[PDB]
Every structure is written in structure tokens, then in C-alpha cells.
Amino acid sequence: EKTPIQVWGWDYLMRQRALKRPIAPHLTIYKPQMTWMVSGLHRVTGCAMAGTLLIGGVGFSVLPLDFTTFVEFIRGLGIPWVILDTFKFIIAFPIAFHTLNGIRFIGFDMAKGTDIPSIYRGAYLVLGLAALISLAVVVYPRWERHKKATLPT
Amino acid sequence: TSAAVTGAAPPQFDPIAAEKGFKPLHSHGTLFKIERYFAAAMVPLIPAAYFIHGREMDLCLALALTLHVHWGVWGVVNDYGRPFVLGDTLAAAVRVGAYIFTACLLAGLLYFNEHDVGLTRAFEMVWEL
Amino acid sequence: KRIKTFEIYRFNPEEPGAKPKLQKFDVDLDKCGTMVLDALIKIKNEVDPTLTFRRSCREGICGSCAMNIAGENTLACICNIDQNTSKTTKIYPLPHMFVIKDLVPDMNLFYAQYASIQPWLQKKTKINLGEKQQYQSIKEQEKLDGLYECILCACCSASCPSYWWNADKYLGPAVLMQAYRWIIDSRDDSAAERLARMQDGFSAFKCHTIMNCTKTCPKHLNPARAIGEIKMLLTKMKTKPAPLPTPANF
Amino acid sequence: SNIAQYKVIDHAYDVVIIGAGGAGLRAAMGLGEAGFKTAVVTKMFPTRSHTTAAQGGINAALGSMNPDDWKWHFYDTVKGSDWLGDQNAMHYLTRNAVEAVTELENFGMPFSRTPEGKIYQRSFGGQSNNYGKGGVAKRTCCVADRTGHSMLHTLYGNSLRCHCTFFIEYFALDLLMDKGRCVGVIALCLEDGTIHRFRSKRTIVATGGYGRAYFSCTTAHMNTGDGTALATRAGIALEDLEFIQFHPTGIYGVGCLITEGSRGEGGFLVNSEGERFMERYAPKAKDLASRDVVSRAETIEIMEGRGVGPEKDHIYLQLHHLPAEQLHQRLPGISETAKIFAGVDVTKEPIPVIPTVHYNMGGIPTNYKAQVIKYTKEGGDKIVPGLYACGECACHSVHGANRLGANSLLDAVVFGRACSINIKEELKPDEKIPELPEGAGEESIANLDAVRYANGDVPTAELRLTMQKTMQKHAGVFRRGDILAEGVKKMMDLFKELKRLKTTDRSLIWNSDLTESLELQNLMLNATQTIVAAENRKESRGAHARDDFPKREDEYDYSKPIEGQTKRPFEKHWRKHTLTKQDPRTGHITLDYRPVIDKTLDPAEVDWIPPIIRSY
């Protein structure tokens, strides 16, 4: 059930489609800026994760394959540790990012930090902490594994 | 020549007319409030699930992600799947499809917790590589 | 000579099977004013009189010349030409608006939505019109700064992807801030009813804090904040204060 | 209609307002809420109108800052008008100024405020207390540096609750006349090329000014004088067109207004030898003298090599001595405009400025009830049935020979409102919407088509530019009999070149080549009538200053004592309104002269103000 202005708004669109008028370009011409790129990223990541939990939870459910065989499969491939830790950093970033940036947005929802320097600072903070926390959570067990492999006792 | 036809007022939203026959759409915002608090609640939940693992966390990730992704996908559907672009029935269809998404997401998550390693362990094993 | 090149979106509806195009125009930067609008006027006047666009003021107050320049939504009349002559500057209409011709977009949904908020002073106990001034403190009317300045140019609304997708249902940043403007006005009695008009899930709540509106506003205003403020009010996390009382002398 | 085909659409309204600035919207409100079926025709969306650029304020004796009397404001208006103003109309203006402004606030206009919570008021050029005797007034009610923007947005929004029906981006072509009566308006719709005829009992002209007839002005590109051209084309003589306000401080290179509020707040002018020269030109009122006076002083300083900057051809407005807290609360608009157009921080540096074309006290003549008039020596003032006019396009005449700052937004609202008051009072349900004559509007379309397809060898933009340059040179701050007479030659030739017009865009949809070519047709009428009137006026009064007739020529010599002299007859003094009557085809202009109305509306309320030597 729409408001009166939403009803009018809808008749406008039909009126404009009936008039065969073009739509002025947007995405493909609007300058990329750290405002909407990051909203981009927040939505891509949020969805890319939601999607992964669907392809996975239903994938491994519906398929004969089990997750343990899938892990051994990829280990059997003999991939270099660096590329494996990159795939790991790539799994972490969307969780670190979307999580951090999601509190920034709840700020915005409460009219907080909405000025331009704040907008732009909190963007770097969020963007940079995420890159940090992800690199932390991946390089930490691998550094402390190479310890165990050679640590005297 | 001016042998012409009688015209009509151009299309104009009279907002006092509109106020005769409209009773406020029941509010949203109550729902918007819980959406956001919920997201806040999920803030500690994620660092916790870095440390504490096992089957009872797997259930909390499962409920909380499902219910959060529900609202998350409802927003993206109502953005890119609009009547103007899709037609009315196809748009109601992708709307319904958002419900299919939530329901299948849970059923797939519950299954994986209950007949496979589960969420926390699954992460451990890729990380151990 | 310092010859600057502009790529300017064209569209001529009266030609059949007509499609939009880009058109390149060269302009001697020393035969021309320092603002983009000057170049547009030059071109119209010398090269191509079919070049079509809105303008009126010359000082960035009317809001007629709103368009997209170097990718950003701004005013041509106060937007400096980038004198880097090697680079071409792209000039498109406000994004995602239906176009009538060249840089001139159909603007009537925007206006309609403006009327939707009832942008006029409402007093619950009716007052005799000429008789006296309503009381209002400085600090109260100072709440209107950042708000009453809006020239209704639509740069912000045409930057908001939420608005790009749902113009029919989402009121957009320009109109919402003017919704807010009549909400936090102490002299206005109908605060709750203004909110009631945009309670639903689309009108204000389709704002996804993308923050393009505040970034692009050529009058350096902040609609994003006014929207948060509506979200706080609308989720009952705040309320409008009450009018400070009118001293009995006054 | 001869080459192409035109879709004509007919409408039927009680009243039709041409224009949606302050004046037009105000009429629209009163009429709307008084139940009338009201059409608003405007060639741009109403917010874009020039009222929106207004900065400094709107005058009314509120007494927010100190005591005040509406009579002291009536006085100041009349002295400002250099006794060419009509006192009935100046009375009605100032009597109503307090109600009109309070109405604005009550409509929701967000005026800046005092600590007592009343409407803030600043000082402004040309105003005083105690009938000239007292000090500088504080009558000028503001919303900072953007009074016109607030006022226009308030009037627009409030128009939204009075069921007026807006026809936006509709370009008005002619009044629809039928044996001396106006029965509506014919216009072109920019969106879809349609031609529209509006039948209406009443028609109100509220189209604004013709500042764009000069090379440099503060006005909008849309100030093309279409409204006064509408009246010319309808067989109506215009009034006092030679009286052109040069606001003292426009920005030097660019034309952009800097408000008189700058000076009202404590800014002053400075020349090359560092002097606050306005102490010499106006010892009492200094940089707050009347606009005609202040622009002259400035112009002389240039001529006599005190001009400032590289070419020593402008002067400096100095605010940097004022505190930034005050510069921000009281002049944010200009602070920013100063930065953008002149690269100036106003807390540290001064703004390059120069007098600039700004207002038009001239226009369509009306009685005090805003009803358009024609005038013969023998029959006097005859109203034009069906037709009212207000705002800058009008000449009531509340400004006479020099408009006083903050009296315009004022005049627009007061006589905008007057228009609706005066129509509710007189127009009665008895009288029904007039039928249109056969062929009504056919000549207007014919002109449109002719212009639309114009073949010739002079493009509409060139002819305009030479009009604007001719005019800047010959009809500027200081005029002279020869320069004027040469000016008129070059101008009636440009009127001739009009038949050699080239247009190019042949569309009907949003063709602004076409409309700007109609705007040049419209501007030329205004310009020619402006300059011939100027050339003929062998006196100096208000804005209009003749180097070769430097004295003001009244029915007496008001420097001497009155009793003992004999009254000069009408034909040798110049205390009288100019009337220009122009044939649109040929361009031939003829002149008559109509007596000033000296009596107020009511002697028991206020006594008229006999002429005196004008000094600040």
C-alpha cells in the first residue's frame, strides 16, 4: 500500500516510458569516489558472503562430497603457502571490512560523522584496519607454525 | 490556425488533496530499529567465534547470519528487482525468491552443522592448510 | 592558443529513432570566462545554437544549471573550467533523469516530491496572519542553517544510487532535508504528522548511507545528516524538542 | 502560422498570473486561497526567478532593533524617489510594509533573530529616523545574506497549499486583447512545442526587469523585459524607463551583486589613495547614501584617476576591518561569492567592485490599485480592463527615479497581495470567463514561426551583444545630449537589423535559440524606449544624471523659498513621468508626459511631502 506521492511517482515513470525519453547515464559516467565505492564494497562483500553460505551449505549438503574430502583435495594439489595465505587473506577481508564498515554505517544512520572529513577518515580507518586485521589473522598462525617447525624445544 | 482543442491542467501533485483519503502507512522503523541493533549485537559475536568454536556457536552463527542476511537480501532485491525494470509479476517473483533464499540458506546451514564439520571447524580446516 | 575540449551529451527528441550521443567542442580558453557555464554559452553563441541547457543566475543561487561535470554533480555557473587542455571535460545531464533535450532533464517528479512534504508553516492553533511575529530564539532559528540554504538544484538526489533505482518511492536527499527543515522548525506544530507521511519502508528508509549527496552538494550542505536525524526521530531514538516558551512581554 | 504547423491548446481560468517571483507568487496565494481558478504561467521553475538572488533585505518598520515609525519609512521612500514617486502608491507601500513582512514570517520565512527573539534588522543605504533628521535607520529585515532566497522559497512552498495550477517553462508571447480589454495570455510550451491560449477575466503581469539590455548587470539571463514588451505589443505606453538603478557594488570583472548589507553592517568604499571618499560625497550618510548618489561618487573617482587595481577602473569595498563572527553570521552568501569570483577572503582583503545595472524603476504604469493604465492629456488615467501588473515589471510608481534598497522584495509582496485584494473586492461571480475573439493569438504564432525559421545574416547572439554594448556606452551612469543622440541612432539601426535575423535550431521542443531570439525582440523594445526617453530628458533626477543639464527641474526651484515664485508650467519642468509609445513593427517611438501624483491616499493618516533639495 503506497502513499499518494508514490502512486503519482509510479504514473510519472509510465508517462516517461510512454514518451520514449532516454535516461541520463549514471554508473558508467559518475566519478568514482571513496563514498559510493565503499558502499559498493560493503554491498558486494555482504552479498558475496551471503552467497557463499548458500552455495556452500547447500552445495556440500546436496552433493555426495563432504567438506573434509574437499579440504584434502586442495591440499593434494600442493599449492605454495603464500598463495594459500592469500586465499585466506581474501576470505578474511570481507568479514573484517563489512563488519567494521557496518558500525560506521550505523553511525551514519544515527547522524554521526556525516561531515566530509569524517566520512573520508572513517573510510580509511575502516579500509585500513580491515587490511590490518586480515593480514594479522593470517600471518599470525603461519608465523607461529614456522616457529613450531624450528623452535628449539 | 487557432482552431484548437480544449486542454487540461498539466500533471501536478496536489498535496492537500492527497491528505484526504490517506491514513499513515503503518510504520517501519520499529523493524529498522531491530535490524540495526541486531547488527550491533553481531559485532562481539564475530570476535567470539574466532576464539570459542564448536557446535553451540555453529548454531548462533547460523541463526544470526540467516536472520541478518534475510534483511540484507530483502534490501538488494527491492533495489535491483523493481517493477519498472522487470514487470510486476517477475518483481513479485524475485521478492518471493528472497524468502526462498533465506529458507534455503538456513536449511543448508542447519544441514552442514548437523551432518558435516560445521561452521567453526570448517574455517579451522582451511586455515590449517 | 589554449584550446580546451568538452564532451557534451546530446539528445534531440524530434529526430526519429534518435539516440543520445557525445559531441566534442573546442574552446579557446582565453576567449572565454573561467566557469564551465561560460563555455556552454560561448559554444551556443558561436559554434552551435542548438546546444540547449538551463541557466538564469550567474552566482550559483538559482539552481537551474545543475548537471554532471567531470563526473560530479555540480553547478556549471560556479564550476571552474579545468585548464589542463590535454584532458577533455565530460558534461552529462544530471544522472538517471529522463531527458527532454541535450543537458535539460525532466524535473517534475523532483518538484512533485517537494510538494509531497508540505513545505510551509503549519500552526495547530490558527493565528491571525499579519498581526504579530511568532517568537523564536536565535539558537532555535540557527537550527535552520545548513537547511534553508538549499537551492533545489537536485545535484544530491541525482547522485544517490538509492534514488537512481527507486525515484518513485524513495523521496531522496534534497526533499528529505527539506522535510527535516520543516520538522526541526520550532514554529512548526505538525512535526509528528510530517514524520507520519514518510513512516514506510521506502520514503526515508531507503537511504543506504552512500553519502554521495553530502559529497556533491555545490552549496556545501549535508543532506545525509538530516536523513540520519529523520531516521533517529522516526525510530523514536530522539524527539523534536518543544518550542522554547514565548516571554510574556513579547 | 504560414510555413509550419502549430498545435493550439485552449484554457479557461478566472485569473492568469504571468510570472512566479515574489510578486507573482504572492498574487497567486491570495487568489488561490480566495477560491479563484488561478493559472501561473512562468518561463522557468518559480524558484529560479530572480527574487531568489536577492540578498540584502526587505524593509519594514518593525522596530526590532530600536523604535521606528512607518511614516519615517514613507518619508525616506519619497525623498529617495526624488519626487518622481507617486505618493498614493508609496503610502500604500509603507503603510502595509509591517503586515506584509510579518505575513512572510507567519508563512514560515526563517528570519535571522534578535536576543529578544524578534526579526533581526540591519541598516541599509538611504534610510533614516525622524523624517530625515535622525540617524541611520535599522528597518531592513534579513535572513542574512540571502533574504530573497528565503522569501521566494517560502512564497513558493506556501503557494503549494492554495490550489494554483502551474504552467512551468511556458514562455509568454502576447496578452490576448479584445477591443481594449485583456482576456488572457498566449504562450509557447517548451516541453512539447504546443501553443497555449489562456482565457481569463483578469491577467496579472509579474515578469520582473530588463537588466539584460546592458553589457554588465547583476540580473539573471531571464531578465529580458518580456513583460514590458508584452504591454508594448498590446498598445500600452511604458513609464520612466530611463530610470535605471546602478547598484554601487557589483563585482568588477563579473557583474555579481555584493549586497548593500555589506555597508549596512559597517563596510565602506575605498579609493586608490586609501580614502573613505564617501565622507566627502555624503558627510552625514557616508557609504549608506542613496544608490544613485553612491554609484556616481564611485564613477567620478574612476574618471579622476582614483580608480583602483591594474587599470585603475574600479574601487574597493572594505569589510576586513569587521569581525569574522559578524562576517559569518551576517554575510555568508557574499563571503563565498567573493571567494569564487574574485579570489577574495573578505576577512583579510577587500572586494573589487564597480557600479552595475541592477533594478528597473521603470515599467508598465499603474494606479495605486496595481491596475494597468493608459494616458491622454485630455482624458487622463484610463484603466485597461482585465489587466493588473506588479513587481519590477510594473511602475506604480513606488520608486520614481531612485529605488531605495529593500523596497523591492517589499513592493513585490505588497502589490502582489494588493492585486488579489483588489480583485476579490471588485471581480464578482456575476461576470463570466470571456470568450476569445476569432483569430486571437494568430499574429503571435506568426511572429514565432517567422523568428523560428529566420533566414538572415546576423545571428541573434551578435545583434544582442551589440545592443548591450551600444547601451552600456550611451545610456550609462552619466549621460549627455550628443552621446545619447548618437546612441539612439545606433539603437534604431539595431532595431532595423532585426529583420536580418538568423536563428538555427528549427525545433519546437526546448528550443532556446528561438526563445532567446524572442527575448532579443523583447529586449530591443525595452532598450529603444529606454534610450529615447533618456535622450529627451534635459534634467538630472535620481539615477538619471545629465552632464549637460545637471540640475533637477521641478515646477518650482525648491532651493529658494517657495512663496514669491510663480509655478512653472508642465511643459518646461520635468517633475513628470515619461511615457514611451512604440510601434513594434516600425520601432517608431513617441512620447507623452503624465503628471506625478503628489497627494497621499489619506491626509488624516499622513501628509504628503513637498519636494526639497535631495542630499545625504
Ligand SMILES: Cc1cc2nc3c(=O)[nH]c(=O)nc-3n(C[C@H](O)[C@H](O)[C@H](O)COP(=O)(O)OP(=O)(O)OC[C@H]3O[C@@H](n4cnc5c(N)ncnc54)[C@H](O)[C@@H]3O)c2cc1C
Ligand atoms: C542580485 C540581486 C539582489 C537583489 N536584492 C534585493 C534585496 O535584497 N532587497 C530588495 O528589496 N530587492 C532586491 N532586488 C530587487 C528584487 O529582488 C527584484 O526586483 C524582485 O525580486 C522582482 O520580483 P518579481 O516577482 O517582480 O520578478 P522576478 O523575481 O524577476 O521574476 C520574474 C518572473 O517572471 C517570469 N517571466 C518573465 N518573462 C516571462 C515570459 N516571457 N513568460 C513567462 N514568464 C516570464 C519569470 O520566469 C519569473 O518567474 C535584487 C535584485 C538582484 C538582481
Ligand code: HEM
Ligand atoms: C559482523 C558484523 C556485521 C555488522 C555489524 C553488519 C551490519 C550491517 C549493516 C548495518 C547493514 C546495512 C547496510 C546497508 O543498508 O547498506 C548490513 C547489510 C548487509 N549485511 Fe551485514 N553486518 C555484519 C556481518 C555480515 C555478514 C557476516 C554477512 C554475511 C553474509 C552480512 C551480509 C549483509 C548483507 C547481504 C547486507 C545487505 C547489503 C546492502 O543492502 O547493501 N553481514 N550489514
Ligand SMILES: COC1=C(OC)C(=O)C(CC=C(C)C)=C(C)C1=O
Ligand atoms: C550499495 O550502494 C550502491 C548501490 O545500491 C544502493 C548500487 O546499486 C550501485 C551500482 C549498481 C550495482 C548493480 C553494483 C553502487 C555502485 C553502490 O554503491
Ligand code: SF4
Ligand atoms: S542540497 Fe545541495 S545539492 Fe541537494 S539540492 Fe539543496 S543544494 Fe542542490
Ligand code: F3S
Ligand atoms: S547519496 Fe543517497 S542513500 Fe543516503 S546519505 Fe546520500 S542519500
Ligand code: FES
Ligand atoms: S545559473 Fe543558476 S546556479 Fe548556475
